[PDB]
Amino acid sequence: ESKQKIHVGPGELDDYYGFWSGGHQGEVRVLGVPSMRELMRIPVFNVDSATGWGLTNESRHIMGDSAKFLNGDCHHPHISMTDGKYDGKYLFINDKANSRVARIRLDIMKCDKMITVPNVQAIHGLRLQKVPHTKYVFANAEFIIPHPNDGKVFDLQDENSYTMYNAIDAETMEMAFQVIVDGNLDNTDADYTGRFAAATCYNRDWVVVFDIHAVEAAVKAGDFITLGDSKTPVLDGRKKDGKDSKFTRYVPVPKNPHGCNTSSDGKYFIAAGKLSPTCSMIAIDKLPDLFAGKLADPRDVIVGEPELGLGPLHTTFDGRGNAYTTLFIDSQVVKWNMEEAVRAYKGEKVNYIKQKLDVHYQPGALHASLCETNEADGKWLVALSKFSKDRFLPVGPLHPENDQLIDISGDEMKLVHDGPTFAEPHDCIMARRDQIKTKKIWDRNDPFFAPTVEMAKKDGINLDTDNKVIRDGNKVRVYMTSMAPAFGVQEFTVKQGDEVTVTITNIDQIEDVSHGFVVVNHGVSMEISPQQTSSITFVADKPGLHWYYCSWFCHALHMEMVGRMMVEPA
Amino acid sequence: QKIHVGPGELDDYYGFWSGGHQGEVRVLGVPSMRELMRIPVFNVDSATGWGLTNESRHIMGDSAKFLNGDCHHPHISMTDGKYDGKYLFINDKANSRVARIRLDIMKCDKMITVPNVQAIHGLRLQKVPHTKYVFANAEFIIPHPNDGKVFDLQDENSYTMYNAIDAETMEMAFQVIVDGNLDNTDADYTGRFAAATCYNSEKAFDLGGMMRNERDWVVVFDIHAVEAAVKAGDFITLGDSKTPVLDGRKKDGKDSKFTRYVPVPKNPHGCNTSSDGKYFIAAGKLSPTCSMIAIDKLPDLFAGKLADPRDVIVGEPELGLGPLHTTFDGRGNAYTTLFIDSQVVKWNMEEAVRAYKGEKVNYIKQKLDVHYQPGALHASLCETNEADGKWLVALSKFSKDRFLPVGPLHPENDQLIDISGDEMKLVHDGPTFAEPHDCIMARRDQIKTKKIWDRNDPFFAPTVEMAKKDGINLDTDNKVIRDGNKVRVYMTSMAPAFGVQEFTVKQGDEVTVTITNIDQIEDVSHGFVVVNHGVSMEISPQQTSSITFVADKPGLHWYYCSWFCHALHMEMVGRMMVEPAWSHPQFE
């Protein structure tokens, strides 16, 4: 019987971390599960006034040139794995809007790396290699574009118009390789060996299967081209006059397949039918024979095609042998047994459908706890539905997404909580509490602000102790420690037009004692947590006295942790 | 009392949360404490395009160049001392602004940078006869003018000001120079009086200086006197602002017509009007008390019928260490946060008053442990004469171990407390991001929202005017207007298709895309994102939205609808073709 506790009362703690995509708002969100409360916001592609992400020098360095963009469009959060189990190291997420992949360090809960994927448009589907560990992040670029895209050729049917499958080195966050494909890429997942990955494609469509070992072999042998000014190795996984690449096989699957999900037992890539009221089950164990040319037809790797309902979009797994698929049109989650569907495909009279649960309304993605791992525990399911209609109080023309928590621990799915969320997160990922280990206090050697430590060294500054103003032409570099309730530099004087950099090192050793730094009427704001160094650059374009203050309540005398910038007129 | 809202059940109250240092406003359901909406205000929102669209940047004015705000004090407009559900207002301490949110469309529709001040902190609204004025404190003393000739805070022209904004026009109404600085503020239930705590009577910049005086004060404003002086022309102006400026400073021990200074200990913080209209209650912070100012003794105070300003104090209950804010159940009880003792203390106001007169009575009813270091607190409808005594939210700054660890930065703990009975009962710990500080609740029936936009809504009326100059009917037209190096694309949109699915421009052209969502169905939002150009906005049913960007990259560039709107949503795409600069006339 499905009978888990859903109430986390005061003083009790949640059992799982939930990492939510920030949707069109561009951040990542940390929730407690089963309470479904938001514990933290992690800025990624958004500009965060609170912490200064997008304003500070540390964040803009990580964002690189893409720091000029104030927007992102997220869908697919995933956690790094070792031996097919979450290892708690990194979270990765896509940006469809400006074609990026971001990495979040789960010990500090900050974005620490970001890459603009070269020569593509719109990074949408994203999942991680599972085995032996997450060596690659796999990222779909959705839209076909000309190559080069220099304005001479606009024809999307041109032989050099295509999109590409993208592999990013998870640890260095540099491109590993790109594979040109036929069609548009939708979603993607990886097997439990490291050899295979797959993606659904549109524009009978197909699942494209990648022999990653073959791609890697060709990269090591130098058998690749490069595109534009990117050194990324580029392999051609397209068909040519009906001849296959060594890198890809195209498996025909009903029109416009959508979700592409690897079962936790490693047996299946499951492509959701969308327009077809079905899912197609690709047997991963038959893929070696497919690439060796031992099979008669690419369709032979299909071992199941359960008929489930109207509008199947995504599938997840309880680790007990059941799959759970969203039905967008029927507005349900359908629970079905995978091995029984396989036997049905062979012609046996067996009902593989176990239950349909109405959800509210029009579900897109769904996620069961630990479903992307061989430890899928079958305890919780989140279905993320697009049209909340009357499930929450009206709040004007815009509506929240309805992310519904479902107890799947027993034979019967039970709906237990409706969670409204902002800007359509689309998908989420859960981890056991003991799978995530966070720092309470920053390490002074942390790579996040290591470039700022290096700049301080060029100025002769010991960030742990010093309170000094460095003059350098029209550049002014203030360095200070902060200890509640006092800034280490409480006043400084500059010339109108000077470019001011303020570097603050929080030397409080008490956990949870955050400081802020805001320069009034200059658009300057940032947070500095214990033992962190943060810095921000602005031009003092207004003569006169200009106050700065600590924004984060840190002390009974917080309101008086302030300072003065005096700007002498030109 | 209903604590938990199950699937298909609805919340009983709207909660409007300050977005803290993050700069937005958040709409919550109460008592579930789930977030139903975010309303962008001083932040740049990728999802809806606030801060990127022409409509939002027009509202923000020149302050659209800032990507940050710092919010604390959300309040709802009132008619005859009851919420009327028309507007919400909130402060920006970071760039010295006040913003207005229209509660029917749940959008910020007006914003003002308060002139000649720094840091808008305390904010509350006139209650009676209605919210004519928004009252806003500027916290920091600055020179006037602030041209960089004088930096001395002790100069006779260094001061801060109390600010009145016309709530309906969102233009400045007046400013009152005060002594000291300004912390928090509230208004009475007659329209005559407002009041503000001051923590820096010493006009210092260092911590010890700001703490020297045994008592600072709460300054009381005679708004009737201020209005009379404005109407009489007895005022000055500062710089190029035409806002009437009145001097509410003392000059050699003689009061102005506009103010009275009530001595109150010490670095007082909260300034809360009781829901029965009897008291301004100032929280003592460094003094373990609150001071109770009898509003009905204030006319006598300004009329010289009292010998000492302290004569308007009729209670000073000792409550605990670090009183910060007070709220009211409408049953005669006040609830005050104790930041150091980490508690909410429930106490009876009329009994505190009797104790001040010497009558030994125990006005303290209950002390509830909160977790940890509470700042502001808010009981449902507490700023109105309808204070219903049902729910209390105490917003604590250090959540410590109350939630799962999430790294060095911790959430705020907003704790929901049942006060409908004699005993306060903690029912829910709510984690929030970037220290909201305070919130305001309203009954479900006090808020009425629109699901579909009116085509004449002032939010995008400037865009309609622009379209008209191009001869555009926004409800029908799908046209590309060319004007030199400017391109103005106008399109209707109806799920799952953009009305204009491709268009061609020259490299370097300034492209404005105006989209009118002509779907007439609730909750069919469209999006518009131009890939790799930093362009994103939302368009809700019957809304017109527009965004301007430079086509600086030759080649083909996809745009797509970001918001799920239709089963064929992923087909709602289009293409911008950018002809390269070397094929067009060359400039320098």
Ligand code: CUA
């Ligand atoms: Cu430092 Cu508040």
Ligand code: CUA
């Ligand atoms: Cu329009 Cu999705």
Ligand SMILES: [Ca+2]
């Ligand atoms: Ca003082």
Ligand SMILES: [Cl-]
């Ligand atoms: Cl998927």
Ligand SMILES: [Cl-]
């Ligand atoms: Cl207050």
Ligand code: NA
């Ligand atoms: Na990078």
Ligand code: NA
């Ligand atoms: Na304005």
